[PDB]
Amino acid sequence: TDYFVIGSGTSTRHLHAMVHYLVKMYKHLKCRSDPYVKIEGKDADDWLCVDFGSMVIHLMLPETRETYELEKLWTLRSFDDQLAQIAAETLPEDF
Amino acid sequence: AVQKMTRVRVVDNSALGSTPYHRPPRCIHVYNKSGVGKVGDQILLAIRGQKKKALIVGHRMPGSRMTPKFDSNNVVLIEDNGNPVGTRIKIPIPTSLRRREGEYSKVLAIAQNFV
Amino acid sequence: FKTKGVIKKRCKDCYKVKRRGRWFILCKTNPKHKQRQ
Amino acid sequence: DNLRIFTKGGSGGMGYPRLGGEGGRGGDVWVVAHKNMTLKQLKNKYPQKRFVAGGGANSRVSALQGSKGKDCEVPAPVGISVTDENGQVLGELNKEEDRVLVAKGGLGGKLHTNFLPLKGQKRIVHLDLKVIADVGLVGFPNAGKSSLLSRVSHATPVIADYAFTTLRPELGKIMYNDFKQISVADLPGLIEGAHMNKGMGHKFLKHLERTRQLLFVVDISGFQLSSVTPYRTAFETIILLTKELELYKEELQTKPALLAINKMDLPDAQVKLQELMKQLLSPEDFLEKALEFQHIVPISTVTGEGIAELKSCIRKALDEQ
Amino acid sequence: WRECFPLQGHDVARWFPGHMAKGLKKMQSSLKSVDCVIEVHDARIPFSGRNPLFQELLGLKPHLLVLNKMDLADLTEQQKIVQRLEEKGLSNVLFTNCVKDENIKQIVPKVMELIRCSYRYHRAETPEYCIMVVGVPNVGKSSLINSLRRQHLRTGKAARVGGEPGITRAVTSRIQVCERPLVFLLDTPGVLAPRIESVETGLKLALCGTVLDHLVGEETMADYLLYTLNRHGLFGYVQHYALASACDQIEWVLKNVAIKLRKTRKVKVLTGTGNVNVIQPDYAMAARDFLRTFRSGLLGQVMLDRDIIPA
RNA sequence: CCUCAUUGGAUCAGGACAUCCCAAUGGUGUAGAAGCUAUUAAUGGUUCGUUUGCAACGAUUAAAGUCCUACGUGAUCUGAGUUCAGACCGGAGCAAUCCAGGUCGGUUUCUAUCUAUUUACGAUUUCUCCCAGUACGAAAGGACAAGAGAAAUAGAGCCACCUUACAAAUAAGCGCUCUCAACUUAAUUUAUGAAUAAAAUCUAAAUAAAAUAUAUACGUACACCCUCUAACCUAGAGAAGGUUA
RNA sequence: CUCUUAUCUUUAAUCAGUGAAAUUGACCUUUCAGUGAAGAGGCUGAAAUAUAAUAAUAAGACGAGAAGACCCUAUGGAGCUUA
């Protein structure tokens, strides 16, 4: 995507309201030729993600944002602390 | 192609998979009307006595031209609510997952490398 | 519309008709009162 | 939300003489906790309210023991209070995984003992979800409570022009900018006393018991309401309100409550509002201990003036306890 | 050291073969000729397993509980066990070791006295006292036939005694046990339950050997030993398996046990470049041997149901 | 005084409707959403496993219907059982033997004479998107029709790619493509209007309409009278059929 | 096994030579409903219908075979045991 957007929300209710408002405005605001966008994560109760053609928005609760740390990964593409801990291995026989 | 009783490689950093255990995970169910599982198709694993949902992110069977064939059947674990269990994926993931009908944006966010 | 063997009126407003080869009691006030033979 | 249910325990199977042995205990009714949504299903779906259990199988040749009967179950809303037909509280399914032996299956028929068969117990059991609102509205007739609920929410409340109106309380959840929803229910105007269940009575007053807090509307016009000839002042009305509430239940008086002045729009009402300020707080010309919570705000429902101010006070008290 | 064994997501232990169903029918039909019913069980598990149907279906006749395998169990609080079992409504309970004929004499006098209180109706004239033994698999139910067969009649083994569950399949004919009271026994196949209660009880019920271990895997069960063995304080596996020091991780202990026993497999692992077959230590074999030592009593005496009995 | 002994599976399925899903409707203690009950309809469909010897569960699905065809079907195949020759325990009998008690072992073959049969069709279901987080509803929650797009399965075909073979010019699927119209009705709902003074009444009155599943009216396919030494063929068992500067 | 596929040999098929077996009341040997003892190519009533081959399937002819099973009978046998 061209732009990656992450925004926290007060509660689950607030999260649903923000997602619905953006989609409603998106359809109203032109995009007549452009196709439609799904709302993903409704089954999820704390993290909702909407992927527009050139932008992706992830709305999640504070604790979910803290655990996943999406900001760090995309800011630091290959130097994320969690990524660093993931090493590589091989498979030798045991003797 | 993943079926019932296939052996799978968890490609997350989640403890459920990451931890070395003498038995690999085996597929118990493929969520399709077709029994076969391809890229982007969910499956139910039996991993360490636990039944856990997962998503296929690559397989050894050939696909259509211009798509990547992997050497192992790769899978990511997703929670019941649909949020990924693990927080990082360092293995390349095909970009076809974006346009397949379904919810894959959460997994794509967690994946740094795309092929 | 219940298909019963005997048709009996249940209220004053109920009335009877012979449509499509069968007897009906049709009540406008209370649709519960509808019966077909 | 205060429905009733009848049940019947299974009968005990009769035994087989000459060493055939016992008969199976009749089936018993166990109300089983499930998703709270079941209350709508119970009252409406499966309208027949009789829950009966299979009687135990009679002892058969070869001295087969009884099947022990077939049990029956009632899915119920979480938080339901199980009470007898007489009103005695058998139990409450406050938490999940809370089954209750509401009815007793017929004692297993045993030929060796005194009784060959025995019939199952059957009873009427009240299962009720009396409105557990966050706060409740208690006021005398013509107070204005329905009008107050009308504007805070969009509930189209029945407006009680005369007494003994709006018998069923109307539940309304109040939305807030914080996305917090507070449920408020307005019951009908209550009569003085009512400890003997006069008129409207205290039967609906059980609904307030469930409510965490109490909301008191104070119609300024009610002050010196001639009626037949009580001519109750608002000062008197509050004293009667406190007294009658104590008689019905001591705990009700102790429960957190708030005060809502009404009908202040009229200039004379504003003069009375100063009289309302005078009444209570500092001692006046009294005509037992009583409680004044002091969460009193001056508003007029008809003009919709000061309504926003009261909303805040309510939420503060709620968030506190 | 861990705090609580993870039981989220694990399933219950469903075994219930067909013979445990056809059998249950024959047992019901045999009520005609049974004066008393004896429930055998594993002393290590006082309050679990315990197929409820036995009290339900076989409740017609008087009942007696015989907790077997007392030798490989901790019975310091035996007094406490009786107190609660009295509350359960099991006034008479017996602890017996079949292999070394411990306390097996007492059973017959109690059955005699117990029968005297009851009525016999149709069988009031028969002089032979026929009683019936039931219980879950591998509780010594078949052995109890032989231990009494010899203790009183001094004749010899008459019922096939085997380690693995399922040896005795159908309800058999009577087996003579004594001559003076002329007591016969009816042997029946072990039945567990159509539905065990909890994932833990089912996990415990596999420890003593009541259900085939492969239905549980033998890997979600070896872990349970280490938990309870360490929790209960019986740090005996370290000495027996010459481990470095106490531990609470299966991958570690089973790594040590496997090396000690010089057991390895050729196991296919799936790496990122394709399947590869790599020789590895037998984690599966160690789990079995670790289980088979526990069950043999060389790892110590245990009270799997603890803090449930005291209360 | 006691008692007790044909049926699973595989393959291929024909049919009933007393309908499990799909479709059209009446009633409601049907606000919406979920449900309940009844009418109509036989259209196509109606999953994969574990322990099992009958059930007992797991994960799914729009649904995992109930029955009849001599377990529908062993000259198509297969496991039990009936049930034996050997052998053990348990229980009988002085023994031989025996038990409608356990268990382990344990050979049915068939070249089809007759009938019958072996060369097209016009599609089902599910999810997502939109309408629209709207109508409704105090909130919670949350539709219908209309409209667009994806797959799954079935049917009919094909080989540019991919894959697997022949270490051949081919054949396959694990690859690719294509699938539609309804003249004719049932439950039910309307309009006009007599018997019957109505400013009534859908009508086994004369009338006008709408409305499941079915189906063949209506289409597509076929259609030519055909030389043959022989060779060749993406046609074929033979014969037939195609091709021949 | 999902879910089958390709190749080669055997057999098959066509040409030449040689040439059996069980089986067979007679047959100019059809479908549906009925009747009947669980039962019909052959009976009752409808219907269908130029004639002969070749290669295939196995629903039927309660298809063909063996010294197969099961119960009962005989003032038929025989082996075994005894009290």
Ligand SMILES: Nc1nc2c(ncn2[C@@H]2O[C@H](COP(=O)(O)OP(=O)(O)NP(=O)(O)O)[C@@H](O)[C@H]2O)c(=O)[nH]1
């Ligand atoms: N002047 C004035 N009139 C008011 C005010 N609030 C309500 N009313 C009037 O009071 C009239 C009587 O009905 P009202 O008391 O509102 O109904 P209610 O609240 O349901 N009464 P009850 O207490 O019996 O349930 C209403 O018709 C309304 O016009 C107010 O603030 N000022």
Ligand SMILES: Nc1nc2c(ncn2[C@@H]2O[C@H](COP(=O)(O)OP(=O)(O)NP(=O)(O)O)[C@@H](O)[C@H]2O)c(=O)[nH]1
């Ligand atoms: N240590 C010990 N082992 C015992 C004891 N009784 C029986 N066993 C063991 O348990 C096994 C025999 O079980 P068995 O007597 O057949 O009991 P069962 O319950 O009748 N068997 P089943 O599982 O078939 O129902 C053997 O491994 C035997 O050594 C005992 O008192 N102590």
Ligand SMILES: [Mg+2]
């Ligand atoms: Mg069919």
Ligand SMILES: [Mg+2]
């Ligand atoms: Mg029908």
Ligand SMILES: [Mg+2]
């Ligand atoms: Mg046949």
Ligand SMILES: [Mg+2]
């Ligand atoms: Mg043949």
Ligand SMILES: [Mg+2]
């Ligand atoms: Mg012999």
Ligand SMILES: [Mg+2]
């Ligand atoms: Mg065998």
Ligand SMILES: [Mg+2]
């Ligand atoms: Mg052999």
Ligand SMILES: [Mg+2]
């Ligand atoms: Mg045999």
Ligand SMILES: [Mg+2]
């Ligand atoms: Mg032929």
Ligand SMILES: [Mg+2]
């Ligand atoms: Mg639509």
Ligand SMILES: [Mg+2]
């Ligand atoms: Mg020849």
Ligand SMILES: [Mg+2]
């Ligand atoms: Mg002819």
Ligand SMILES: [Mg+2]
């Ligand atoms: Mg016929």
Ligand SMILES: [Mg+2]
């Ligand atoms: Mg004829």
